[PDB]
Amino acid sequence: SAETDVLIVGAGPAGAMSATLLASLGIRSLMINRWRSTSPGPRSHIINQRTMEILRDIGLEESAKSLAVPKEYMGEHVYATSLAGEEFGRIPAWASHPQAHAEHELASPSRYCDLPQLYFEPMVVSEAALRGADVRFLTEYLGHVEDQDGVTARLLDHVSGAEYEVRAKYIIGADGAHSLVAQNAGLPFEGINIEFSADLSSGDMYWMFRGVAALRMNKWICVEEKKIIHEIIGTDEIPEVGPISTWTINQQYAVRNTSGRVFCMGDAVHRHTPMGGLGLNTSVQDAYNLAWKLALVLKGQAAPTLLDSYDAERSPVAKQIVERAFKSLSTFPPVFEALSLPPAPTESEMAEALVRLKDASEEGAKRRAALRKAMDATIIGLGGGHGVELNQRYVSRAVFPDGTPDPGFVRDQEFFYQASTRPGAHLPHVWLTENQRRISTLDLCGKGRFTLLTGLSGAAWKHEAEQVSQSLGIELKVCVIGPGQEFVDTYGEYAKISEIGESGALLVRPDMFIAFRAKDASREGLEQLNVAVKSILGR
Amino acid sequence: AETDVLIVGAGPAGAMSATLLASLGIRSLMINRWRSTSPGPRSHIINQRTMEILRDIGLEESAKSLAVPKEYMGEHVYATSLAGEEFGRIPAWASHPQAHAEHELASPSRYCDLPQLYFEPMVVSEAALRGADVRFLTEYLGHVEDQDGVTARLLDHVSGAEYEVRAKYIIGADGAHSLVAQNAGLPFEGQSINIEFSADLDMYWMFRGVAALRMNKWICVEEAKKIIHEIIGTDEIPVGPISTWTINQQYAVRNTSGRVFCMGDAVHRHTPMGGLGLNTSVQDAYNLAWKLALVLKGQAAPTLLDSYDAERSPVAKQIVERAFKSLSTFPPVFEALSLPPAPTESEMAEALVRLKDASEEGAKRRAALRKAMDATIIGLGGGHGVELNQRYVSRAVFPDGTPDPGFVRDQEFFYQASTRPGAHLPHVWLTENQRRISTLDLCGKGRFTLLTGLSGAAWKHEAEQVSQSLGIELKVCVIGPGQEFVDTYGEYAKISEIGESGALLVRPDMFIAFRAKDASREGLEQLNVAVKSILGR
Amino acid sequence: MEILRDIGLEESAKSLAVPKEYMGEHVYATSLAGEEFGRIPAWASHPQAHAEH
Amino acid sequence: SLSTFPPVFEALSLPPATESEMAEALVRLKDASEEGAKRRAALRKAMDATIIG
Ligand SMILES: Cc1cc2c(cc1C)N(C[C@H](O)[C@H](O)[C@H](O)COP(=O)(O)OP(=O)(O)OC[C@H]1O[C@@H](n3cnc4c(N)ncnc43)[C@H](O)[C@@H]1O)c1[nH]c(=O)[nH]c(=O)c1N2
Ligand SMILES: Cc1cc2c(cc1C)N(C[C@H](O)[C@H](O)[C@H](O)COP(=O)(O)OP(=O)(O)OC[C@H]1O[C@@H](n3cnc4c(N)ncnc43)[C@H](O)[C@@H]1O)c1[nH]c(=O)[nH]c(=O)c1N2
Numbered sequence A: 001s002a003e004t005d006v007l008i009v010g011a012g013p014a015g016a017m018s019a020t021l022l023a024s025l026g027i028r029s030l031m032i033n034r035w036r037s038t039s040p041g042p043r044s045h046i047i048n049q050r051t052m053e054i055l056r057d058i059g060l061e062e063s064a065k066s067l068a069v070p071k072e073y074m075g076e077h078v079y080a081t082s083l084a085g086e087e088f089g090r091i092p093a094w095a096s097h098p099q100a101h102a103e104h105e106l107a108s109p110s111r112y113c114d115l116p117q118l119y120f121e122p123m124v125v126s127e128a129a130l131r132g133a134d135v136r137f138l139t140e141y142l143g144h145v146e147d148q149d150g151v152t153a154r155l156l157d158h159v160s161g162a163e164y165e166v167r168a169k170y171i172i173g174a175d176g177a178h179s180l181v182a183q184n185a186g187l188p189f190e191g192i193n194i195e196f197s198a199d200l201s202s203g204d205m206y207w208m209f210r211g212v213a214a215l216r217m218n219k220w221i222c223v224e225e226k227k228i229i230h231e232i233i234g235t236d237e238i239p240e241v242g243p244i245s246t247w248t249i250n251q252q253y254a255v256r257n258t259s260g261r262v263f264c265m266g267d268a269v270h271r272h273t274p275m276g277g278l279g280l281n282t283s284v285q286d287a288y289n290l291a292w293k294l295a296l297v298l299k300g301q302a303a304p305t306l307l308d309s310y311d312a313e314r315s316p317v318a319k320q321i322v323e324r325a326f327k328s329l330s331t332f333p334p335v336f337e338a339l340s341l342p343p344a345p346t347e348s349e350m351a352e353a354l355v356r357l358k359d360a361s362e363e364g365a366k367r368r369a370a371l372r373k374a375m376d377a378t379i380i381g382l383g384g385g386h387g388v389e390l391n392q393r394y395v396s397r398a399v400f401p402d403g404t405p406d407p408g409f410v411r412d413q414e415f416f417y418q419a420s421t422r423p424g425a426h427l428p429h430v431w432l433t434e435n436q437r438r439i440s441t442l443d444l445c446g447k448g449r450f451t452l453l454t455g456l457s458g459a460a461w462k463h464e465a466e467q468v469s470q471s472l473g474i475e476l477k478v479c480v481i482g483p484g485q486e487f488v489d490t491y492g493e494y495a496k497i498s499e500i501g502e503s504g505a506l507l508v509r510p511d512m513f514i515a516f517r518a519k520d521a522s523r524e525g526l527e528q529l530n531v532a533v534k535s536i537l538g539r
Numbered sequence B: 001a002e003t004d005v006l007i008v009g010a011g012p013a014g015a016m017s018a019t020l021l022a023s024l025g026i027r028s029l030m031i032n033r034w035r036s037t038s039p040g041p042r043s044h045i046i047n048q049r050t051m052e053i054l055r056d057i058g059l060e061e062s063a064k065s066l067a068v069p070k071e072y073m074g075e076h077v078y079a080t081s082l083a084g085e086e087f088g089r090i091p092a093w094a095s096h097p098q099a100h101a102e103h104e105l106a107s108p109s110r111y112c113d114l115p116q117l118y119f120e121p122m123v124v125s126e127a128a129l130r131g132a133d134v135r136f137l138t139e140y141l142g143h144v145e146d147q148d149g150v151t152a153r154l155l156d157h158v159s160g161a162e163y164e165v166r167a168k169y170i171i172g173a174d175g176a177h178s179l180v181a182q183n184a185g186l187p188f189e190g191q192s193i194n195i196e197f198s199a200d201l202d203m204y205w206m207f208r209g210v211a212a213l214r215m216n217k218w219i220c221v222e223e224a225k226k227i228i229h230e231i232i233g234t235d236e237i238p239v240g241p242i243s244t245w246t247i248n249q250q251y252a253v254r255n256t257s258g259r260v261f262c263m264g265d266a267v268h269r270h271t272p273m274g275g276l277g278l279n280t281s282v283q284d285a286y287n288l289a290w291k292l293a294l295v296l297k298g299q300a301a302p303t304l305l306d307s308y309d310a311e312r313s314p315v316a317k318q319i320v321e322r323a324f325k326s327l328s329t330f331p332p333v334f335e336a337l338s339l340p341p342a343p344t345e346s347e348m349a350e351a352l353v354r355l356k357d358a359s360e361e362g363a364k365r366r367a368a369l370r371k372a373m374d375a376t377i378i379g380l381g382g383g384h385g386v387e388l389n390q391r392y393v394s395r396a397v398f399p400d401g402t403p404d405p406g407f408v409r410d411q412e413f414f415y416q417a418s419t420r421p422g423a424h425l426p427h428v429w430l431t432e433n434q435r436r437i438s439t440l441d442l443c444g445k446g447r448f449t450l451l452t453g454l455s456g457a458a459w460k461h462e463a464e465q466v467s468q469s470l471g472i473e474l475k476v477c478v479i480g481p482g483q484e485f486v487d488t489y490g491e492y493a494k495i496s497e498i499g500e501s502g503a504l505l506v507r508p509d510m511f512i513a514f515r516a517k518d519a520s521r522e523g524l525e526q527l528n529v530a531v532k533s534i535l536g537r
Numbered sequence C: 001m002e003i004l005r006d007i008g009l010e011e012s013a014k015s016l017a018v019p020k021e022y023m024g025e026h027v028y029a030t031s032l033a034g035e036e037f038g039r040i041p042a043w044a045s046h047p048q049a050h051a052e053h
Numbered sequence D: 001s002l003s004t005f006p007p008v009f010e011a012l013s014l015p016p017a018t019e020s021e022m023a024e025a026l027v028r029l030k031d032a033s034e035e036g037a038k039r040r041a042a043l044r045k046a047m048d049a050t051i052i053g
Helices: A013-024 A049-058 A061-067 A098-107 A117-131 A180-185 A279-298 A304-329 A333-338 A347-357 A362-381 A386-390 A460-472 A493-497 A523-536 B012-023 B048-057 B060-066 B097-106 B116-130 B179-184 B277-296 B302-327 B331-336 B345-355 B360-374 B384-388 B458-470 B491-495 B521-534 C002-007 C010-016 C047-052 D006-011 D019-029 D034-052
Strands: A002-009 A029-033 A076-080 A087-092 A134-137 A139-147 A150-157 A163-173 A193-197 A205-209 A212-216 A219-222 A252-254 A262-264 A431-434 A437-440 A450-455 A476-481 A505-508 A514-518 B002-008 B028-031 B075-079 B086-091 B133-135 B138-146 B149-156 B162-172 B193-198 B203-207 B210-214 B217-220 B242-244 B250-252 B260-262 B429-432 B435-438 B448-453 B474-479 B503-506 B512-516 C025-029 C036-041
Touching: A002 A013, A002 A150, A013 A029, A013 A049, A013 A117, A013 A163, A013 A279, A029 A139, A049 A061, A049 A279, A049 A386, A061 A117, A061 B060, A087 A362, A098 A386, A117 A134, A117 B116, A134 B133, A139 A180, A163 A180, A163 A279, A180 A262, A252 A304, A279 A304, A304 A362, A304 A386, A333 A362, A347 A362, A431 A493, A450 A460, A460 A476, A460 A523, A505 A523, A514 A523, B002 B012, B002 B149, B012 B028, B012 B048, B012 B116, B012 B162, B012 B277, B028 B138, B048 B060, B048 B277, B048 B384, B060 B116, B086 B360, B097 B384, B097 C047, B116 B133, B138 B179, B162 B179, B162 B277, B179 B260, B250 B302, B277 B302, B302 B384, B331 B360, B345 B360, B429 B491, B448 B458, B458 B474, B458 B521, B491 D034, B503 B521, B512 B521, C002 C010, C036 D034, D006 D034, D019 D034
Parallel strands: A002 A029, A002 A163, A029 A134, A076 A205, A163 A262, A450 A476, B002 B028, B002 B162, B028 B133, B075 B203, B162 B260, B448 B474
Antiparallel strands: A076 A087, A139 A150, A150 A163, A193 A219, A205 A212, A212 A219, A431 A437, A450 A505, A505 A514, B075 B086, B138 B149, B149 B162, B193 B217, B193 B242, B203 B210, B210 B217, B429 B435, B448 B503, B503 B512, C025 C036
16 A cells, blocks of 8 residues: 555656656655556657747756757658659758748747657656656556545556555546546547668658658668568668557547546547647646646645646647647648549559659649649648647636737637737747846746746736735745846847736746736736636635 | 566666666566665766777767766866965866877777766666666565575565565675675675755865865755855855765675675775776676676576676775775875865965965975876876776686786776787777778677688688587677778777787677687687687586 | 967968868778778877877 | 888789789789788788878
8 A cells, every 4th residue: 555645647758747747846646657668669759849848947958958859950851752762842841941940939948859759758757756756667557446535546566466556636647548547537538660770871751652651760760571661762772670560549539638536638638640749749738737736736725626727728739639630641642633643553653643743844834833732731740830839728717817808810820829928828938138148938937836027117016926925825936027137128029028018917827828917017907916816726 | 576687776787787688688677775866966977988888788879968078077176265276287087188099099988977867867768678677666675595596575665565576696786785795795805075056156176175176056075064165265155955975995805695796886885086986887787797698598607607706806806995095195285285184274375375485495395286286187087097907817718828918007097908818809990881980899789709800711610610509699700801891990900919810709798708819720629619618618 | 380370360270271180081092982992090180199299 | 201102002012003903903902811911911001101291
């Protein structure tokens, strides 16, 4: 028998990030994993800005960057018949087009990077243990029972062969795409990788229309006597040929992610195809949504109803990414159609298409233009979906509305990020300075606590926040941004992005979402802080 | 539970043993009492032998990405305090151009500064990935040995349960108060407050007797921590975590008892001068693992394991005595300033004014101070010979009849390459498809390798016979023009000390076990007898 | 270079030049595509020569 | 320093100036005999002596 506050079943990105955050917040956790090691395979490698912002908040962004390939080396996607064959063209993937890159820089202090899951996992798992989480591998969750005060789970130890029980206040189901935890909580659902080595002496990612195969990276992956590798390369005048692995995926999202004291996250609540690099990133963001809420509830600073916001905020995103990843698959077949090929052409059919594509006729021109259109429409799955990645819009009892209408989106909300300071949107990034060194708005906030941002004519917020803090027993850090202060609006970018007057305030949750906005520091405005915070905390 | 090897401890020694044993196809269970890898500032100087090991197993590039390269380690400063007067500087970690050349010539690898805080998780994750079972919050309580194996009792600090593990061997990698070594009855001979802090202010030695300062975040070596003031030393700038290390200087005279092998701090406990501890501990593991693997696979006799004590015990004594002796180089600095070992602020102020005296007496003091500062270098990068000049004598090294050539220059300060059996294979650059590759990169990977040139082609057939007969892999590399590996710079011919048709047999740990002068019939016939002798067969 | 340094042109010279790290690989061959006889460390590129430099 | 180049041709057993003669020299330089090892060593020695220039 063991006892903990939270039992975390699974030590992939979702579980390991939950353990790390809970341990940083002073909460006792036990994280288990069935297997001997972290994940070995080529799996994820695209890390998006929201994940990198989370790592930045907890102090792991610089270690992530030292293991990763920066964004400048991710842009060249090549569409071809094979590596040696004819190139159809290229596309600027991962926001490498100058305009896309500007939109990227404006959105976040962080950037895309290429960091194999193979490295990402042990980095976060070692951090969880260092910060205080108990971590135990070769240990399998078999089931649990729940009562009025907690949960009791049965675990099988694969080193000793012993079974034992663990008693917890809450269980996190971070146990992947066939989650037993989710099955036991009764959650409702709706909806070949080949490593090899070779010297390819004679861009960053190749899409081969052979229907579609992918090739990247001495060591290579494409997606046992594997002369699929020939064909893709495609010659046989060069010669390894394994390890080989498979992923069966059945597209489904949990409609609800919570049942009593059980919270599921990650692939356990969203299972989808890998198009867009959304899985690991969304899974880490699920953890970041939940952990601070658990910590407040366990410390008695919030009522248990604060936990209802997890489902209300993260379930819509589960459905969104599943549908989006699926839709992005449909953008590849039109490439074959533009060449006047069927989805699985013969060698003779392909050969004819290549000659036809170079024809000096009007028919040839029509095909070249159609091919370019089709290739351009794949970018939604390969870096174009910046809006999908960033445009979270939360509606829950952990976001206190300010009475303003939803302004919607000026441009397409899938392709383009739109900054907003309305409650329910992520705090916008802009550069300020601290001692003449650039610092992001995001660097003022987070660290497991609420933060209130204002300017010099909003000095009354400091005292108002101290009262609410004292009264509710919760930390509220106040930052008064302006000339001569600790943090300075050196570029004028804060006044430009805040959408409110200098004396207004933004209350920012530990996960960086705006929970309350006030237009000014009038007595009526100031009195609302205490009512918003009580409402957010269910008190 | 049952495993081939139980590894008690997951520091550098244990984690490296687990990684190597897993890479060799051996089942192991590595345990650690605590929840995490080591949190503290502890080791940070990684030497070339350790970096070579990481290179052999494919972790050198990951280590380098986490580390600070050698170009940022050289500036050691001797002073009264950070804001006070500087006595002078010394080129530490082989940063002087001549020391740097000697360093480059010795190895494909380089010093780097890599905190143990990052080193440990990198190796522990690799061990699990490659097949080791790894289990933290698990404590070794004791064991009993019989003629077929060992049975250990473990306490699980998650479940509170005790259970037993059955193994063929136990590795005691359990640190400076090793319970394993105490239970194996090993005989021993031979006779710091670290303060982290943050402040807005490469290495400072403060003669205040001596304090060190390095690195927003700083370490020097809880409101009484205005020791930090004094060292900085002002208080016009605005104090934990604090930690202690007791070390009692001791080395194990023997490192093995029956089926128990101890390694690392468990067999060599010493002061931190010279950055020898972690490095020596990783090298103990690299000596043992391939031997254990051959024995467990039935390709070597159990007597191969006797060479672990014969090769590694002399190193244990050597580093303990060396680290201690380097401490004695600091007090002469106070003596050159004509100060007592703990001077007052007034006495030191007077020493500083005398040190600038425009007389012949002042010039004598300036020269004496320089001489004393220069003699500290043996503990701060000067001991390249100590780091690299391993000379093994054992049944796992087959002598070639030649006398020991000794050392032309001082064997502590200077590395001397040798290809005589019992010395480390020398590094030189060859090419493979016009890309530079080290001699070391031809060898290792858990197996024996035989190196020769084009007139030594007969070695290929001889090695095949021995390999087939003994059931062991022997990779043969024929170095020359038109071959897979080419002597593009001529450096192999220059370093090998034998004719082109001679051969060097290199062990999995990169030590030379056999050398042949030529490929005559008498020379070729010796291979099989050397390999049998090395394997105890 | 010492002369250029004395008169204040060394940094301009360096901005126009290729540094010493890119001068060492001298290759002896029958032709560029043919067989290579071997290489030599030119312009003090051997580590000992570089130290002396 | 000019006089250090001709010993390279001599180590290959070539005269100072045909394509056939050179082709033979490259095959002999890979010869597995003790004579081939002598030629490889002589060639290296000759190449090394050009470093003065
Ligand atoms: C080919 C490919 C390529 C990509 C991606 C997937 C695939 C298949 N993804 C998605 C990503 O790999 C996936 O979404 C994450 O691994 C999900 O992380 P989780 O922590 O939810 O599950 P994960 O599956 O990673 O972890 C589940 C954990 O639970 C453990 N477990 C299961 N049952 C257990 C039990 N009963 N008891 C104890 N432990 C148990 C498992 O052992 C494992 O540790 C991605 N994403 C992205 O953002 N960018 C990208 O580029 C890609 N690319
Ligand atoms: C301040 C300072 C600074 C330096 C150094 C030391 C110190 C104190 N060193 C030396 C270096 O840190 C030391 O030599 C190594 O950590 C030794 O590694 P081990 O694996 O042998 O022991 P280590 O002590 O690292 O690990 C022992 C393991 O066993 C575990 N354990 C103990 N008893 C157990 C039991 N009964 N059951 C289960 N687990 C148990 C412990 O929890 C731990 O995992 C160094 N070296 C260097 O090369 N360069 C440098 O710069 C420095 N600097």
